[PDB]
């Protein structure tokens, strides 16, 4: 209630007693309800599933990337964008990945990254016309709009 | 050239032309009563057969599908007509 691309509320089956706490991920291009989205460094490279970038191949596009393993969420989280691993140096766990503008941030090989793009592409590839639905979007965001010219004040 | 009986030509320029470029469009091909040494029943096979002909009981190969005349399979008694 206040964003662009939806979220996959992935609940985990607590391995410390009969308990089911619902945790949260971002949007993944094409993921159905009841999808067995497995999470593990030993879990195979599948779309929507998550595990270490160094524990997977180069070119692989992941999301909700974090400079630290267990951050539960850092970079590559915005609607419709992605990240691409362009380098693997197994000496001192270093995974060189690329962001949306063109960054060479080489992180850890155990660094958390889930395969897939954020569900919400072509969101800005479509003009809103009515600044009224622009008013409708900020309804659950903040008042960083409307803006004015300092040449007017 | 200049003059020749286009009615009674030699067997020479007769077998060295296309079936429709000849004086009568006839089968420049043939047939074969090929068969495998085990079955008594002979199988009438077409020259450019294409489809693989089998026998009455045991299914076998007699002619392999080719761009033209289905090549014979190793060695089976082929009898023209």
């Amino acid at each position: 209630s206040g964003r662009g691309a939806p979220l996959a509320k992935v609940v985990f089956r607590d391995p410390y007693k009969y308990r089911l706490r619902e945790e949260i991920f971002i949007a993944n291009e094409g993921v159905h309800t009841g999808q067995f989205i497995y999470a593990g460094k030993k879990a195979s490279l599948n779309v929507g599933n998550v595990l270490p970038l160094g524990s997977v191949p180069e070119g692989t596009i992941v999301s909700n990337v974090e400079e630290k393993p267990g951050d539960r969420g850092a970079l590559a989280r915005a609607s419709g964008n992605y990240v691409i691993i362009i380098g693997h140096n197994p000496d001192e766990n270093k995974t060189r990945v690329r962001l949306p503008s063109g960054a060479k941030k080489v992180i850890s090989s155990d660094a958390r990254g889930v395969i897939g793009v954020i569900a919400g592409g072509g969101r800005v590839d479509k003009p809103l016309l009515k600044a009224g639905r622009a008013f409708h979007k900020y309804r659950l965001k903040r008042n960083s709009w409307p803006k004015t010219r300092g040449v007017a004040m | 050239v200049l003059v020749q009986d286009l009615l009674h030509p030699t067997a020479a320029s007769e077998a060295r032309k296309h079936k429709l470029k000849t004086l009568v469009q006839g089968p420049r091909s043939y047939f074969l009563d090929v068969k495998c040494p085990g079955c008594l029943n002979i199988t009438t096979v077409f020259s450019h057969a294409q489809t693989a002909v089998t026998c009455e009981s045991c299914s076998t190969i007699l002619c392999t599908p080719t761009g033209g005349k289905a090549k014979l399979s190793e060695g089976t008694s082929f009898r023209r007509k």
Binding site: - | V24, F31, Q50, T51
Partner: protein, 150 residues
Amino acid sequence: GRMHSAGKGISSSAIPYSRNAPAWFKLSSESVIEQIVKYARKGLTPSQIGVLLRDAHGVTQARVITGNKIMRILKSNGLAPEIPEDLYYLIKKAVSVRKHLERNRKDKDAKFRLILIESRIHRLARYYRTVAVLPPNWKYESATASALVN
């Protein structure tokens, strides 16, 4: 002139000048009749039915065995199709290019190829309603033609 193309290919059928014969054919007219009804009861269509008689059996042609054709033989026995042989495989192949452009919409040449298949299929149905063999108000909408021929 091979219509829509420029290729002047002369690769066709050259039926013998012998209207009778063979003289080296066993069985009789009953055998070719029952064996042609057997391949129509299997679903091979006169095109494939006539070719299988050529090498599997000893049938050179239908005129060289009986006074009727494999098309007019299936008509008599009641094991004939609802539409012509070329009309069936023209709509079946206009489904392959139409459903293909659905998996590849940017196929400029396949869209023009899909159009020549259908343009040709319409010249075909133009004379088919002109000879009264199929429904006269037959509307060719490859939309229901994909789940019509299959």
